[PDB]
């Protein structure tokens, strides 16, 4: 009367997930990085698979319901950590384009000046 | 349910539960003693190996798939000192900005290990390549820290006793063996024994430069040899 | 004369000669490499009547004497100024006595401490030490082991003496493992399988009522009902059941000895209860 | 924002050849330092001294074994006019038969006699033999001790390498292990290697090498091991025989060649008392007198 | 696109918060059919994690996690040094 709704609502999540998995796990992880020459996009592709695997092993431990959730949780903070490095690097790159455009637009004003 | 359970205590079911319990207590200690065996025949030697194998994939010394590189082969050619750092110190080009007297002071930190007496603040053409090599060694200690290896940076860095730099630098400039022993309290044959270990590092640096095609290093190293292999270090024995 | 020119006037060479002219010798590694062997020559020529040596002349064979004299009961090995044990000392005893030259060997040790007899039985009459390998890992090893293709870095690990006692401990347990496999198979045959489905309910009785013991026991509760004389089931930590009791009083366990010890509100209040089931050999005189 | 707060947020909740062997000897009675005789004299004027010898072999799997106590050496690769004390006779017969062997004996017990049988044997097989000594000073010692014995002996060291093209080679473990990783051509002509000072594998720094080299050494070569009198030697024989699949004999003895006398000297005292005899029997009451003595001293001792 | 797919993963973890919401000892104590059903539902998670192992191909999970962030260590070392040398 209470768990009988959630079991459908839990299993419908994975059935909505598993054909996305078989497409995502279709090409091997070393193969798909070999398609992308972008090393910056490689850092997104690698950590995404670890974030998914950390998501379900935590959730399988939530299905197992062991009261000891400590070792599964700290590696998630590493998984939390290695996405933080990515964005701060990119903001340097994007604002580096903001810097070189600041001169070329200013210098060609001086050519008019 | 215990009321609606068939055989609640019927036909002495709790004694039969005791017959189930002692079966459970024997069958349950097996899987705890099997895992006492199953965790016994595990090789204890891969876990620190994989942390080391983590490191060798980092620095270009090998591939992620365990294939030896030239950097690994250069590390295979070095056995006198730190095969990690000397492979780093060569490939970073630190010996390019050195003289045959300058580099050997940087090599003196590697053929000598025992605790000795503190040198003063040294010459700026000596402390600077010492200042160059420490941050490289600080970088390696960072990755070994990253590989969860119990390494103190300072114990990684200041394991290298840099007090015999001034001896070898001047022994690379034609000095007397009498004069150079007065610059420390380290005993004389112990200084001879480390020069003859320092020969072995040149024997590597003669050979390591052959592996790459860096005779610019090697001819500079061969200048060090005659600045090493002379009056007292060149001697022979009496069993021979 | 075999040395070069300027080397023949080094002061360590100069001052070591007239001691040797007296037949007095010094042997340690801080001497020159040439000075190590030539003193061993004249010791093997016997013209050195006393040697003062470092500990590696233990290893130097083909040069024994008659008497080995110790001046030091203990030696700082870098980590401990320790009594020398037996198998250390027996190889330290292995130097005295020339074979066809001496009838006896004389071992003398200097001491200024009160040695207990089991120490002398443990040092002088001691046993040999265990050859147990100290295999570790090296970075130059790993790239060598990946280099030599037919062998692996795991291949050295297969035959390791560093893992040997954990290898030897397994045939001890496989004897015990084999027993219990048959010791189960006699009690494997259950006359009715429903006791297992009972067991999973019967342990659920001891499992799901186990939670309520952690729930009945709430720290700030069972309060405004602990007036004295009240009937109470007395079972400290669920393992020492003292039956039904009667409340005498309660009081706060205010710990002024170190206020940093903060009690849960079970522990912070101390209740006295009279129970009638305390065993006759219980130490009534020791509880506070 | 933060995606990782989904994990923080709340759920919406409602062995063979094992034996002990006897051997003995007799030694002249002497006072040493104590005022009377150290031990009881024989009626003949000696003092008789006995000692124990142990042997055991680690058997290979599927190996049909003939006991070496049943073996006879018809001809020696190396001559010895003296009396072969049968811990030496047992092991040279193993080297005569062609087997790996451990010798766990004292430094003066006679480990020199046994291992040198394997040297001329390869020379009587026209093969090359290798002696591994741990110390350079021992290497120069064992070169001089063996080159004067045969002459076809070479040296490789980190310091000085003379005659790599000799039939025998006094050299180190670290010469040898590196040549395994170098893949040296001398490793082709080897059927026999002597290991000196085998109990050095317990070193926290270098003891890795005496283990790592042996597993790198081939299953063909029968080995010679000179180790000290050690108690746990047979578990080592399991470690030898498993990894090479060739038989490994051990030779244990308690044999003490020169008879020793243990005296205790108090600092700034004179009473110098035998506390352990030649027969390893602790004098408890002389020791009591040694401690009851307690309420530059070298010059007292030497003169 | 990952913003499509990870948003599908977001719903799964939130529904994984929906399953580890309540206490299951009321219905699992009742029937093995309830007990086997989530035992049937847990068989997905053993099989779904095994698919990622084939992409790689409890103490095994530690051997998983260091290898995952490992070339992730390698990337940013190349990403900064592509700009540090620039």
Swiss-Prot record, chain A:
It comes from the Eukaryota. Keywords: Exosome, Nucleus, RNA-binding, rRNA processing. One of its GO terms (cellular component) is nucleolus. GO terms for molecular function: DNA binding; double-stranded DNA binding; double-stranded RNA binding; enzyme regulator activity; protein-containing complex binding; RNA binding. Coiled coil: none annotated. It is found in: Nucleus. GO terms for biological process: exonucleolytic trimming to generate mature 3'-end of 5.8S rRNA from tricistronic rRNA transcript (SSU-rRNA, 5.8S rRNA, LSU-rRNA); maturation of 5.8S rRNA; nuclear mRNA surveillance; nuclear polyadenylation-dependent CUT catabolic process; nuclear polyadenylation-dependent rRNA catabolic process; poly(A)-dependent snoRNA 3'-end processing; post-transcriptional tethering of RNA polymerase II gene DNA at nuclear periphery; regulation of gene expression. Belongs to the C1D family. Associates with nuclear form of the RNA exosome complex. Interacts with RRP4, RRP6, RRP45 and RRP46. Required for exosome-dependent processing of pre-rRNA and small nucleolar RNA (snRNA) precursors. Involved in processing of 35S pre-rRNA at the A0, A1 and A2 sites. Required for activity of RRP6 in 7S pre-rRNA processing. Also has a role in 3'-processing of U4 and U5 small nuclear RNAs (snRNAs). Acts as a mRNA export factor. Mediates mRNA degradation upon UV irradiation. Maintains genome integrity where it is involved in both non-homologous end joining (NHEJ) and homologous recombination pathway repair of double strand DNA breaks. During NHEJ, required for joining 3'-overhanging ends. This is Exosome complex protein LRP1. The gene is LRP1. The chain holds residues 5 to 117 of 184 of the full protein.
Curated annotation (Swiss-Prot), chain B:
It is found in: Nucleus. GO terms for biological process: exonucleolytic trimming to generate mature 3'-end of 5.8S rRNA from tricistronic rRNA transcript (SSU-rRNA, 5.8S rRNA, LSU-rRNA); maturation of 5.8S rRNA; mRNA processing; nuclear mRNA surveillance; nuclear mRNA surveillance of mRNA 3'-end processing; nuclear polyadenylation-dependent mRNA catabolic process; nuclear polyadenylation-dependent rRNA catabolic process; poly(A)-dependent snoRNA 3'-end processing. Changing residue 54 to E: Severe growth defect. GO terms for cellular component: nucleolus; nucleus; TRAMP complex. The keyword Nucleus applies. The keyword rRNA processing applies. Keywords: ATP-binding, Helicase, Hydrolase, Nucleotide-binding, Nucleus, Phosphoprotein, rRNA processing. The modification Phosphoserine is found at residue 10. One of its GO terms (molecular function) is ATP hydrolysis activity. Component of the TRAMP complex (also called TRF4 complex) composed of at least HUL4, MTR4, PAP2/TRF4 and either AIR1 or AIR2. Present with 12500 molecules/cell in log phase SD medium. ATP-dependent RNA helicase required for the 3'-end formation of 5.8S RNA. Cofactor for the exosome complex that unwinds secondary structure in pre-rRNA. Required for nucleocytoplasmic transport of mRNA. May serve as a chaperone which translocates or normalizes the structure of mRNAs in preparation for export. Component of the TRAMP complex which has a poly(A) RNA polymerase activity and is involved in a post-transcriptional quality control mechanism limiting inappropriate expression of genetic information. Belongs to the helicase family. SKI2 subfamily. This is ATP-dependent RNA helicase DOB1. The chain holds residues 834 to 1073 of 1073 of the full protein.
Curated annotation (Swiss-Prot), chain E:
It comes from the Eukaryota. Disruption phenotype: Deletion mutant is temperature-sensitive. Impaired growth at 37 degrees Celsius. Impaired growth at all temperatures, nonviable at 37 degrees Celsius. Mutant is defective in the 3' processing of the 5.8S rRNA and accumulates a discrete species, 5.8S + 30, that is 3' extended by 30 nucleotides. Accumulates 7S RNA. Accumulates 5' external transcribed spacer (ETS) RNA. Accumulates extended forms of snR40 small nucleolar RNA (snoRNA). Accumulates U24 + 3 snoRNA. Accumulates poly(A)+ snoRNAs. It is found in: Nucleus, Nucleolus; Nucleus. Belongs to the exosome component 10/RRP6 family. Nuclear-specific catalytic component of the RNA exosome complex which has 3'->5' exoribonuclease activity and participates in a multitude of cellular RNA processing and degradation events. In the nucleus, the RNA exosome complex is involved in proper maturation of stable RNA species such as rRNA, snRNA and snoRNA, in the elimination of RNA processing by-products and non-coding 'pervasive' transcripts, such as antisense RNA species and cryptic unstable transcripts (CUTs), and of mRNAs with processing defects, thereby limiting or excluding their export to the cytoplasm. Present with 2160 molecules/cell in log phase SD medium. This is Exosome complex exonuclease RRP6. The chain holds residues 5 to 106 of 733 of the full protein.
């Amino acid at each position: 009367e209470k768990i009988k709704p959630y079991v459908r609502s839990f299993s419908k999540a994975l059935d909505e997930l598993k054909p996305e998995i078989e497409k995502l796990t279709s090409k091997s992880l070393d193969e798909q990085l070999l398609l992308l020459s972008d090393e910056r996009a490689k850092l997104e592709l690698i950590n995404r698979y670890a974030y998914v695997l950390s998501s379900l092993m935590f959730a399988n431990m939530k299905v197992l319901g062991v009261k000891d959730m400590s070792p599964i949780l700290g590696e998630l903070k590493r998984v939390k950590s290695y996405m933080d490095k990515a964005k701060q690097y990119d903001n340097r790159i994007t604002k580096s384009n903001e810097k070189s455009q600041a001169e070329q637009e200013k210098a060609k004003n001086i050519i008019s000046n | 349910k215990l009321s609606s359970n068939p055989l609640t205590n019927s036909m002495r079911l709790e004694e039969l539960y005791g017959k189930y319990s002692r079966k459970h207590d024997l069958h349950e200690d097996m899987k705890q003693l099997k895992r006492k065996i199953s965790e016994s025949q595990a090789v204890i030697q891969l876990d620190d190996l994989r942390r080391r194998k983590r490191v060798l994939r980092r620095l270009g010394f090998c591939t992620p798939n365990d294939i030896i590189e030239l950097k690994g082969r250069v590390a295979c050619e070095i056995s006198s000192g730190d095969e990690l750092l000397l492979t780093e110190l060569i490939f970073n080009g630190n010996f390019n900005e050195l003289k045959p007297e300058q580099a050997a002071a940087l090599l003196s930190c590697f053929a000598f290990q025992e605790r000795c007496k503190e040198a003063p603040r040294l010459k700026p053409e000596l402390a600077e390549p010492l200042k160059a090599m420490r941050e490289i060694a600080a970088k390696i200690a960072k990755i070994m820290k990253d590989s969860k290896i119990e390494v103190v940076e300072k114990d990684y860095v200041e394991s290298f006793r840099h007090e015999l730099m001034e001896v070898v630098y001047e022994w690379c400039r034609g000095a007397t063996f009498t004069q150079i022993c007065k610059m420390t309290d380290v005993y004389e044959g112990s200084l001879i024994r480390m020069f003859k270990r320092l020969e072995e590092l040149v024997k590597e640096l003669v050979d390591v430069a052959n592996t790459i095609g860096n005779s610019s290093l090697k001819e500079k190293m061969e200048a060090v040899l005659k600045l090493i292999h002379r009056d007292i270090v060149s001697a022979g024995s009496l069993y021979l | 004369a075999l040395l070069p020119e300027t080397d023949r006037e080094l002061p360590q060479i100069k001052h070591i000669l007239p001691l040797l002219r007296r037949g007095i010798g010094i042997h340690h590694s801080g001497l020159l490499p040439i000075l190590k062997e030539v003193i061993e020559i004249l010791f093997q020529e016997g013209f050195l009547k006393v040697l003062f040596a470092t500990e590696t002349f233990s290893i130097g064979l083909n040069m024994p004497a008659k008497t080995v004299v110790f001046t030091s009961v203990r030696k700082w090995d870098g980590q401990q100024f320790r009594w020398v044990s037996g198998g250390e000392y027996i190889q330290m005893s292995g130097r005295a006595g020339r074979r066809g030259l001496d009838d006896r060997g004389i071992v003398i040790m200097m001491i200024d401490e009160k040695m207990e007899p089991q120490v002398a039985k443990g040092m002088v009459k001691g046993q040999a030490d265990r050859l147990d390998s100290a295999f570790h890992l090296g970075y130059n090893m790993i790239l060598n082991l990946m280099r030599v293709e037919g062998i692996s870095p795991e291949f050295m690990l297969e035959h390791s003496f560093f893992q040997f006692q954990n290898v030897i401990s397994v045939p001890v347990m496989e004897k015990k493992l084999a027993e219990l496999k048959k010791d189960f198979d006699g009690i494997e045959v259950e006359d009715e399988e429903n006791v297992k489905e009972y067991h999973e309910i019967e342990q659920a009785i001891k499992g799901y009522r186990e939670d309520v013991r952690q729930v009945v026991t709430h720290p700030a509760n069972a309060l405004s009902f602990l007036q004295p004389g009240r009937l109470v089931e007395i079972s400290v930590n669920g393992k020492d059941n003292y039956g039904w009791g009667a409340v005498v009083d309660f009081a706060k366990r205010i710990n002024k000895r170190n206020p940093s010890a903060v009690y849960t509100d079970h522990e912070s209040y101390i209740v006295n209860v009279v129970v009638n089931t305390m065993y006759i050999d219980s130490p009534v005189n020791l509880l506070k | 924002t933060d995606l990782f707060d989904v994990f923080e947020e709340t759920p919406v909740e409602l062995l063979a050849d094992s034996f002990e062997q006897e051997a003995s000897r007799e030694v002249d009675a002497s006072k040493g330092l104590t005022n009377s005789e150290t031990l009881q004299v024989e009626q003949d004027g000696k003092v008789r001294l006995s000692h124990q010898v142990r042997h055991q072999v680690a058997l290979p799997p599927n190996y049909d074994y003939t006991p070496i106590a049943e073996h006879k050496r018809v001809n020696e690769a190396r001559t010895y006019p003296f009396t072969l004390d049968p811990f030496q006779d047992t092991a040279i017969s193993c080297i005569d038969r062609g087997e790996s062997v451990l010798v766990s004996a004292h430094t003066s017990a006679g480990k020199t006699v046994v291992a040198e049988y394997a040297i001329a044997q390869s020379l009587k097989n026209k093969q090359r033999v290798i002696y591994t000594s741990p110390i350079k000073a021992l290497s120069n010692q064992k070169y001089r001790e063996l080159l004067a014995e045969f002459g076809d002996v070479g040296l490789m060291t980190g310091d000085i390498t003379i005659n790599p093209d000799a039939g025998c080679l006094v050299m180190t473990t670290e010469i040898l292990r590196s040549m395994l990783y170098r893949g040296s051509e001398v490793m082709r002509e080897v059927a026999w290697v002597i290991f000196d000072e085998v109990h050095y594998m317990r070193d926290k720094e270098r003891g890795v090498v005496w283990e790592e080299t042996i597993i790198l050494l081939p299953d063909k070569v029968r080995y010679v091991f000179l180790s000290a009198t050690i108690p746990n030697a047979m578990e080592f024989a399991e470690w030898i025989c498993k990894i090479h699949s060739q038989p490994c004999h051990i030779v244990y003895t308690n044999f003490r060649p020169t008879p020793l006398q243990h005296y205790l000297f108090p600092a700034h005292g004179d009473g110098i008392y035998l506390v352990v005899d030649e027969k390893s029997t602790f004098r408890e009451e002389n020791f009591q007198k040694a401690m009851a003595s307690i309420s530059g001293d070298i010059y007292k001792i030497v003169k | 696109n990952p913003d499509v797919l990870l948003s599908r993963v977001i719903n799964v973890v939130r529904a994984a918060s929906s399953l580890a919401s309540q206490d299951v000892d009321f219905y699992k104590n009742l029937d093995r059919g309830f007990s086997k059903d989530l035992k049937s539902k847990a068989d997905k998670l053993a099989d779904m994690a095994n698919e990622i192992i084939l992409s790689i191909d409890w103490n095994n999970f530690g051997n998983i996690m260091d290898n995952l962030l490992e070339m992730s260590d390698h990337s940013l070392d190349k990403l900064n040094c592509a700009i540090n040398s620039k």
